[PDB]
C-alpha cells in the first residue's frame, strides 16, 4: 500500500515536525520485525513557505505525526499545533498549517478513495 505524506507550512511562525513510523519486515527465519524510521528533517526549524512530500512504503506501520510551533531564543518554548499517532497509512495525506503564532491553524486531508 503505497502512500504519500505531503506537508505544507504557510504559517507566520517557526514550526517543527516530528514524523516517525515503523517498517514491517521479516528475517531469514521469517518472523515479524518493526524497524523504527523517521523523517530526516525531524526537529528542524521550518518557516513559510515550506512544502514537502514524504514517500511511505506499504510495510509502513505506526505512523506518528507531530507538529509544533516554537518561540524563545537560546532555549525554545513549544506548543503542539497538531498531533496524531498510529495514523492510517492512506494513499495520500496532506497536512497543512497556517495562521499566526497565537492562532495557528491546521488541516488534515485524507485521500484513499
Author numbering: 359 to 471
Paper passage:
The cholesterol-dependent cytolysin (CDC), pneumolysin is a virulence factor of the human pathogen Streptococcus pneumoniae (pneumococcus)2, the leading cause of bacterial pneumonia and a major agent of meningitis and septicaemia as well as debilitating diseases such as otitis media, septic arthritis, keratitis and sinusitis. A central feature of the toxin is the formation of transmembrane pores in cholesterol-containing membranes, which lyse or disrupt cell functioning, depending on the concentration. Pneumolysin and other CDCs bind to mammalian membranes through a tryptophan-rich loop and a threonine-leucine pair within a membrane-binding domain at the base of the toxin. Once bound to the membrane, monomers then oligomerise to form a pre-pore complex that subsequently undergoes a complex set of structural transitions to form a transmembrane pore, typically comprising 30–50 subunits.
